[PDB]
Every structure is written in C-alpha cells, then in structure tokens.
Amino acid sequence: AQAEIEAERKRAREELRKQVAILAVAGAEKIIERSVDEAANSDIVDKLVAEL
C-alpha cells in the first residue's frame, strides 16, 4: 500500500506537467502571431539563408 501511494505520487506529478505545457504553448501561439514583426521575419530568413 505504501509503495502504491509513492507510485501514485509520480502519476499525479506527470499529468500537471502535461497540462501546463500544452496550455502554455497554446498561449504562446497567440502571443507570437500577435508579435510578428517584419524585421524579425527578415532576420529569420537572413539566418536560414546564411546557414543554407
């Protein structure tokens, strides 16, 4: 029973990791699309054509 509860502990922890990560990136998509900037887009292109 006691080892069972310490397994259940890890089972509880992992689910919270999952929730927070998914909902955080859901917010991040909104934040990043709303924060697009043409100079930053050009800098992404200027990075990838510099390594390509």
Add this chain to the structure above:
Amino acid sequence: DLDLAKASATDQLKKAKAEAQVIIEQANKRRSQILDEAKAEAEQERTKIVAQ
C-alpha cells in the same frame, strides 16, 4: 490371553493414529481461521489509508 493382548495393543495404536489425525485437522482449520482474519484486517487498513 495372547488374542486379548494383541487386540488391545493394536486397537490402542489405531486410537492413537485417529486422534493424531484429528489433532492435525483442528490445527488446519485454525490455520484457515487466523489467516483469513489477517487478510481481512490488512485489506481494511489498506482501503482506508488509500482513501485518506
């Protein structure tokens, strides 16, 4: 007299064998009783601790 002596000795031995067998069967039934009591107590404890 030998008939009587032989018969009494052998039936005494038979009595001893039967008595030993029932002694052991009483032990077996007691074994079942105590083991099921332990099982019930353990299950009761485990269920209440996990709910808590």
